[PDB]
Design a protein around this ligand. Structure first.
Ligand code: NA
Ligand SMILES: [Zn+2]
Ligand SMILES: [Zn+2]
Lengths: 441, 440
């Protein structure tokens, strides 16, 4: 109900199973938080100007609207998914307005480039934050540069306890522009002024999600009337409902699950484990293993049943489908709850997929904000043929059992043994390339 | 021509539009019989700046770009039922695109989105004049070595003169259409192929504007043909090479308009003395109708009428403009014109709930100009005839004066219906929409 920053409505209804999974996740996380110190983390804002690039007019009031819009959006989307209205807290002054730290870089735009705008702007943010007693390497920071397109950075990266977002200011940029239907003039993108603000501010929400540790997650068959996933193509649809263009952008339940363990969102200062490590995808990862893991083929999808070997508290599980040759934008995800013994059961589909072999990512969300992730080769079709899945049990049973237990080198040896013993058989030789690919992620 | 990633044809024209195209070309061919041939070419100018040197391979890359757009227009004109008409390029002894190099002795810091356009065209005029070419009598594509947010992406002109504006980028080439790798680090999260689609499809879109084409969106009669190039097709040009969709197609109503452009048909027809610019792109002349009746059908109207031909015409185009929408939201239908001026077309807008909608009727003359009138019409899903019948009893004199171009008399007659029967329910809703049409 905050019209001062053009608060976005909720234009989708969560599926009942995801809301039930959200409640079970928050119940588990709340028990984990009992007795742990509270978090005072805030999302800090730095405004970077340059030698021939002074601060734009009203940037303090306009970005007070922008961040409050993103803050309300995340809270409202968290609440729509079944969680409490969790969101990041801002630094407010005595008047309740957004505190923005101003930084300057003594370099002209001619001396800047697409590859240097990022690090140079963050370097200026480090200095101005340290002067105020804030360590940039231990907080989440949004760096706003007064740079144009083709020079300035639109980027985001981080994890649960540290992250950095990058965006660029523009004259009159404000969430109030979301309603404008007038066309922009003279630009390569033949698009309205309202969508242009959607790209800017919706992009900022997309980069901030990246800074919290969220990779890309596209739309799925289970949400055909919810708009575009914010961490997918939703960055370009954020606020489209205010122009009656569509359903806008929604926070995917699998992304809501991951953020529920972020201290910036839940307010609890949990400690990261010692074995946390960065991976190919955004986030912090720890080793994990399963007691059993089977993907059963169904019509246009898979039914994933398994039992996690829980050596640490976990609150949920997320299954991804990654089509070969596609980017992370093309993946779809399904979430599920975990019982105390570690059993889970979910169904993930990709209707119309003709490629047959597809990669599946199974992520276990731990209460310490980290994740354990494994990549499994699976076969899928419209009919739901069981023949490839049966060859995976008969020939590749030892490979899977070792792989889901994290024994990569032993699984490779067992994979080499079936290739040398039965590699000439047609039903075996087609599983070898997708198994070798899965064993290297 | 795979050397420049020639685009395929990903749509099939409706049979009536192809039949309309053949009848239009037959009429235009008779008009061209005995007229001098045209040597017009679309000239290309590359503008560099003080701290903005020419990008690598810009000569070979824009040889691919212009040949791609040239082949696209030819293939889309042929798909619509016309001969493979397109613009001709200036080719050297090796058959490569001739590019005129222009320089502006100003740094990029002194350029802006609003000033890059006119400053670039001025530099193009000088280098073209040095070669004996008058920019105000030809079609020119101005390419600036400028980034986004500084450089111009614009287009404007008519049948006998036009200017297109675009900006170069590192590695911009139609061969990039197939790339599915993500760009990264940009405000627009799009693949490298999508980025090239926006650049080159934009150029094709601006060139269409330079030929005299306004915006024309998609319509119900082509739901599986892709996006209209003069609508949102600028962002779908070449999408089929990534299996993203059907790409961009040239709307039959736009193909009709281009058939009278000397750059496309090769005949140097003379512009009439009464040609004038209008609210929309193109050259316009006064026109009138002997009769004009819109018959309501399901989700649309059937338009029958007879143009009062005071000059040779080869076709007619009807547009529907929903209230509150931009030019991107209009849909258009083309039709052929007989020697007496008779025409018959059907235009629909399924799902439109607004009831009252504006219709633009454009007559395409053989001298490259158009006559256009704006009519208020009513439309619904059922196809109810009641509002159109009240439109016949009242406002009868208003339409008769309006289709004869007598604006002031139509306004006076409109005030008479408001004073005599303005309280009647079947009359009072036509009054506001008629004043809007009489002022458009
Ligand atoms: Na065996
Ligand atoms: Zn991203
Ligand atoms: Zn345009």
């Amino acid at each position: 109900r905050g019209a001062e920053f053009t608060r976005l409505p909720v234009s989708w209804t969560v599926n009942p199973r995801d809301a039930a999974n959200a409640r079970a996740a928050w119940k588990t996380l709340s028990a984990y938080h009992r007795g742990k110190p509270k978090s005072s983390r805030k999302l800090h804002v730095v405004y970077v100007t340059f030698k021939d690039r002074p601060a734009l007019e009203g940037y303090r009031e306009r970005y007070d609207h922008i961040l409050k819009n993103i803050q309300a959006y995340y809270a409202d989307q968290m609440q729509a998914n079944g969680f409490p209205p969790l969101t990041f807290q801002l630094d407010l002054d005595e008047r309740g307005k957004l505190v923005i730290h101003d930084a300057y870089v003594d370099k002209p735009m001619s001396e800047m480039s697409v590859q240097s705008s990022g690090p140079v702007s963050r370097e200026a943010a480090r200095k101005v934050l340290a002067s105020k007693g804030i360590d940039i390497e231990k907080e989440h920071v949004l760096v706003v540069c007064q740079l144009p397109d083709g020079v300035g950075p639109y980027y985001g990266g981080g994890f649960s306890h540290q992250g950095t977002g990058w965006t660029c200011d523009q004259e009159g940029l404000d969430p109030a522009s979301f309603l404008d239907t007038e066309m922009m003039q003279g630009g390569r993108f033949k698009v309205t002024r309202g969508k242009n603000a959607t790209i800017y501010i919706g992009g900022t929400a997309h980069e901030l999600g990246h800074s919290f540790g969220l990779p890309h997650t596209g739309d799925g068959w289970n949400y055909p009337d919810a708009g575009a996933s914010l961490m997918g193509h939703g960055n370009s649809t954020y606020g489209d409902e205010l122009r009656h263009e569509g359903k806008g952008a929604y926070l995917a339940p699998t992304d809501a699950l991951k953020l529920a363990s972020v201290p910036l969102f839940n307010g609890v200062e949990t400690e990261l484990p010692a074995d946390a490590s960065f991976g190919r995808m955004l986030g912090k990862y720890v080793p994990g293993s399963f007691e059993r893991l089977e993907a059963i083929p169904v019509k246009d999808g898979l039914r994933l049943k398994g039992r996690v070997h829980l050596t640490r508290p976990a609150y949920g599980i997320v299954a991804h489908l990654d089509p070969p040759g596609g980017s992370d934008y093309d993946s779809n995800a399904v979430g599920a709850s975990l019982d105390e013994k570690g059993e889970f059961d979910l169904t993930i589909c990709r209707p119309g997929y003709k490629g047959g072999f597809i990669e599946m990512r199974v992520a276990v969300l731990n209460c310490d904000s980290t994740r354990s992730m494994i990549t499994l080769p699976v076969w899928m079709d419209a009919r739901g043929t069981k023949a490839p899945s049966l060859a995976q049990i008969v020939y590749f049973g030892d490979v899977q059992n070792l792989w889901i237990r994290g024994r990569t080198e032993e699984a490779r040896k067992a994979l080499a043994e079936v290739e040398r013993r039965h590699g000439s058989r047609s039903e075996v030789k087609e599983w070898l390339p997708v198994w070798k690919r899965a064993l290297g992620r």
